[PDB]
């Protein structure tokens, strides 16, 4: 740990800076006040930074300031005098703007400046961002006569206190002693890893101080917990320093200390079972990668084909990464907005890992080096401790890019600990993928190697992923070989230069392309035509009738088939479901419908997913077993009619996640991704092809039938500026794409596309208009002191578009048997009753539902398995995320929540 001693010293400065910033009386008055709450005044951290600036400057050499600090006798009148006032009047020189502190001092100020929030700047200029931190001024602080009052009401600054002054002097002496440290520090402040470490250290110490319970006047906030103000600021500064000492020690400690999951029997063992060959090959490559990789970092791509289950390959990579010591650490971050308990459980089952060994981040995490500072029994700490933590990519990404708060700190620590695995879907639009790449880059530098299972990944995106690690590697070495898992073979490239990596990518791509060129064994593509949901709905029903006859299983005179209807958006799917309900099954047929999307409360959705997973395992000669299996048996008993269609009407999340093999599917088109997912589902487990059509695709996006453009969005690769000349699907997909449709189309690396020539082509182009190629280059963010500010994040925000708050069907605080629709506020829920409208669904002839869930029953099950109160535990487990809508929602037990209009 070469930089640790310096990092610790830097951390030890910051709390003192913060207390100093704290001093001005307005703040004291606010602590006094209780109510009504006062404005700021101008952030306390900003005031502290001004205080730090005032003593030293201007202009003082790092050494002189340290000498003043290190010497006890001074003073301290000139320093007390010096600091500028913005008011009285107008402009004052911005601190650190020019010719101010020695750079080390500026870094310290940023560390101090940082704690309330990362700096924000109205200016979006690229040049300004690179210079950082020089541009940071009033806007960065986020902060008058009130300000002057805050400066005044006084009385008595630090450097009066006996204990605070001595510690500062000692720190200054240490800084002077440390060979080479001041100049290097002044140059360095910019380095991203160092800045991140300092910020992380500051957040945790402050949190610990806040948690903990002689003459000194200045003080910390009180009222939330016992009335009046408790403690004194100086004591707070000392506490912060103490914490800072401890955090550095813990960081140095963790690798040996930290909880790890290792040497699982299953992962190491080769897989006897057929069709596991690619994973085995990848695992064998693992030893070489590890020898190369730990010293040099690791960037891996598990590109095993879609419609083939992924668990083994990721598991093998994780096992491969560390042996035999420190086993095992890794995190599986899925590219979904929400992780259900069931999905995590399935992943765990795949890995043959105990639940305690594998933690699910559902934020509740299901099962201390940071323990002393940390809460004894707390979720973030639990997530860190687990040998593997499961949750999702989005939360980690948010933690890496955070406008404010400790939570950002915990998230960064989490990203830091060993190495973060994504799944593919997250980028969505060449741009969002770019933000994801930025997060990944910030991540590697902490030193985690992240491996991407690019079943559908674009070559350019892969190149971007390769680059970020490369910047990270430069940071990391101070503090690359890519392995392509394939069913055929895995190739690992040890390549210094991203361009070199790409060509290696090109070569890898060539072999995969050859495999694609071999005609796909499984998957037919249908071009049909819709003559809105009801008109479409009828066509879908006809397709379903066709597919079951074509593709079904017979046992003892009866025939069962399983179908998938994929719609892009929740409202459209709901409309289709309503149309289906009014209409029956077609003559002679019994239709069982299961509605599956992300709208439904989380526990119920998880239960539905689990049921589907149990139902949708498919094996050769498995039709009889399926008949034997309880849902099938029930259907057979229930009704005379021979022909049964079990049908899932689903959204994108279900499409994205589920190891389900389906006899047929009718799919509304959203992109190459929709197509690939559909193909994998279409052939999840069963060898051989009828060669009759088993997958039906529709003509214009439902918005297109509406005629809304761009036709593909939300999620659409297409963007309004990058228009595609013809809406219609039939033109968009090539005859080759139509036949033996397979990822191959995505895996390229396809040139030369015509903006409107290929839908896949459009995707690649847009994705590149993303990445290296209103577009602040990701390379620019990597190059510069982006880390200093939140400007890049503001420029390219994660989860762009409004986010619905979080709601639940809550059993009443008084009465367990009454339910209220409730909104989560800030540590509590407000009455929902007023808004939410609840609606029945009519049932069609020879139609019923399956894989459904009664909410009360689900709550009871949750209570039984977790030993919770019905209301509290059902909250924990019953959230649904919804975009705020003034008039509320309709709710049906089968269908979930739909907006209003």
């Amino acid at each position: 740990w070469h930089s640790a001693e310096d990092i610790r010293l830097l951390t030890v400065m910051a709390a003192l800076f913060h207390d100093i910033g704290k001093a001005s009386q307005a703040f004291q008055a606010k602590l006094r006040n209780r109510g009504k709450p006062m404005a700021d005044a101008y952030r306390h951290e900003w005031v502290s930074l001004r205080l730090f600036e005032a003593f030293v400057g201007p202009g003082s050499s790092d050494e002189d300031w340290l000498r003043r600090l290190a010497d006890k006798r001074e003073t301290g009148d000139a320093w007390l005098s010096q600091l500028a006032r913005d008011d009285r009047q107008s402009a004052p020189p911005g601190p650190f703007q020019k010719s101010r502190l020695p750079p080390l001092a500026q870094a310290v100020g940023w560390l101090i400046v940082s704690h309330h929030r990362l700096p924000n700047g109205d200016h979006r200029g690229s040049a300004s961002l690179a210079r950082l931190p020089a541009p940071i001024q009033s806007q960065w602080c986020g902060a008058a006569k009130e300000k002057a009052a805050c400066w005044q009401f006084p009385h008595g600054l630090p450097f009066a206190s006996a204990h605070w002054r001595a510690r500062t002097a000692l720190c200054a002496q240490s800084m002077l002693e440390r060979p080479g440290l001041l100049a290097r520090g002044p140059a360095l402040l910019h380095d991203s890893y160092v800045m991140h470490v300092s910020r992380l250290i500051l957040m945790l110490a402050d949190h610990h101080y806040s948690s903990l319970p002689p003459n000194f006047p200045l003080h910390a906030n009180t009222d939330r917990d016992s009335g009046k103000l408790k403690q004194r600021l100086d004591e707070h500064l000392l506490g912060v320093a103490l914490h800072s000492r401890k955090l550095a020690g813990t960081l140095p400690r963790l690798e040996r200390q930290l909880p790890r999951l290792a040497r699982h029997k299953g992962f190491t063992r080769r897989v006897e079972q057929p069709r596991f060959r690619w994973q085995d090959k990848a695992y064998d490559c693992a030893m070489a990668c590890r020898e190369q990789a730990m010293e040099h970092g690791f960037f891996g791509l598990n590109l095993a084909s879609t419609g083939c289950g992924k668990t083994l390959a990721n598991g093998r990579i994780l096992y491969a990464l560390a042996d035999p010591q420190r086993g095992a650490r890794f995190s599986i971050a899925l590219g979904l907005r929400s992780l259900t308990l069931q999905t995590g459980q399935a992943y765990r089952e795949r890995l043959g890992l105990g639940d305690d060994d594998l933690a699910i981040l559902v934020s509740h995490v299901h099962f201390g080096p940071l323990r002393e500072w940390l809460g004894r029994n707390s979720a973030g700490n639990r997530l860190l401790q687990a040998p593997i933590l499961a949750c999702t990519i989005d939360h980690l990404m948010p933690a890496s890019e955070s406008l404010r708060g400790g939570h950002q700190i915990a998230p960064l620590l989490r990203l830091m600990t060993s190495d973060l695995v994504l799944d593919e879907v997250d980028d969505f639009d060449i741009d969002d993928l770019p933000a994801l790449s930025r997060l990944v880059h910030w991540a590697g530098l902490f030193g985690s190697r992240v491996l991407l299972s690019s079943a559908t990944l674009p070559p350019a995106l892969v190149q971007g992923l390769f680059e970020a690690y490369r910047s990270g590697r430069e940071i990391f070495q101070r503090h690359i070989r890519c392995a392509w898992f394939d069913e055929f073979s895995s190739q690992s490239s040890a390549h210094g230069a991203v361009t070199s990596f790409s060509e290696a990518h090109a070569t890898f791509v060539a072999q995969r392309l050859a495999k694609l060129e071999q005609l796909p064994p499984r998957r037919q593509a249908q071009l049909c035509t819709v003559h809105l949901c009801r008109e479409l709905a009828g066509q879908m029903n006809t397709w379903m009738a066709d597919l079951h006859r074509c593709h079904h299983t017979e046992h003892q005179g009866r025939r069962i088939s399983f179908g998938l209807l994929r719609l892009a958006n929740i409202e459209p799917l709901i409309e289709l479901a309503q149309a289906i309900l009014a209409q029956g099954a077609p003559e002679g047929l019994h239709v069982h419908l299961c509605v599956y999307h992300s709208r439904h409360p989380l526990l119920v959705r998880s239960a539905i997913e689990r049921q589907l997973d149990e139902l949708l395992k498919r094996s050769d000669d498995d039709a009889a077993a399926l008949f034997a299996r309880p849902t099938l048996a029930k259907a057979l008993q229930a009704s005379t009619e021979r022909d049964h269609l079990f049908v899932v009407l689903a959204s994108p999340v279900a499409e994205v996640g589920r190891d389900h093999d389906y006899d047929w599917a009718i799919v509304e088109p959203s992109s190459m991704r929709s197509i690939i997912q559909l193909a994998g589902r279409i052939r999840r487990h069963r060898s051989g092809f009828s060669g009759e059509a088993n997958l039906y695709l529709l003509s214009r996006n439902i918005r297109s039938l509406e005629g809304q453009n761009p036709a593909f969005q939300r999620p659409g690769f297409e963007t309004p500026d990058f228009p595609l000349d013809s809406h219609d699907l039939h033109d968009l997909l090539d005859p080759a794409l139509l036949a033996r449709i397979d990822a191959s189309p995505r895996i390229v690396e396809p040139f030369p596309l015509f903006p409107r020539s290929r839908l896949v082509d459009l995707e690649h182009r847009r994705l590149r208009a993303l990445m290296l190629a209103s577009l602040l280059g990701v390379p620019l963010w990597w190059q510069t002191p982006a880390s200093l500010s939140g400007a890049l994040q503001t420029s390219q925000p994660f989860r762009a578009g409004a986010k619905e708050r979080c709601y639940a069907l809550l059993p009443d605080e008084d009465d367990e048997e009454r339910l209220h629709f409730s909104r989560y506020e800030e540590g509590t829920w407000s009455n929902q009753d007023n808004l939410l409208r609840n609606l029945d669904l009519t049932y069609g002839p020879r139609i019923q539902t399956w894989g459904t869930v009664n909410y009360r029953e689900e709550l009871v099950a949750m209570a039984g398995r977790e030993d919770l109160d019905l209301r509290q535990c059902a909250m924990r487990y019953g959230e649904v995320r919804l975009r705020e809508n003034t008039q509320g929602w309709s709710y049906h037990p089968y269908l979930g929540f739909k907006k209003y209009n």
């Binding site: 509406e706 909104r823 506020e825 009455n831 009753d833 705020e884 003034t886 008039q887 209003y900 209009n901």
Partner: protein, 135 residues
């Protein structure tokens, strides 16, 4: 988006601010006269704007979302004015939706989430003040 509500609230800012600021501390079980007046004044301004939008057809019928949402307001008006029904205070009817806009205004301006006690008190005020707004 909720474009119809935004348009009406944006032409009611003085009444909206007065209502929000008046009801910040409010106990719906013991309202002051000024809190009652601030609620009635905001509701009356919303009512005037929403009735004008409906009767005058201030809408883009080609906008699938805006037109459907307009039609829900129009349906509520027809269920208040006698053309379909004469029940202005029924659940999810005209005044109920206006009370919902007032809850939304507080949520989206000051981050406060009011529930049944506030909503029911608004509906009681509207019953007292506005019986004659419809035949």
């Amino acid at each position: 988006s909720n474009t119809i509500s935004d348009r009406i609230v944006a032409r009611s800012v003085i009444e909206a601010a007065r209502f929000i600021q008046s009801w910040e501390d409010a106990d719906p079980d013991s309202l002051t006269e000024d809190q009652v007046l601030a609620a009635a004044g905001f509701a009356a301004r919303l009512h005037e704007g929403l009735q004008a939008t409906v009767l005058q057809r201030l809408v883009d019928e080609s906008n699938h979302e805006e037109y459907r949402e307009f039609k829900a307001w129009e349906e509520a008006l027809l269920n208040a004015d006698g053309r379909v029904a004469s029940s202005p205070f029924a659940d999810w009817g005209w005044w109920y939706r206006i009370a919902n806009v007032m809850l939304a205004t507080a949520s989206q301006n000051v981050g406060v989430t009011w529930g049944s006690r506030v909503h029911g008190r608004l509906m009681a005020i509207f019953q007292d003040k506005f019986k004659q707004r419809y035949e």
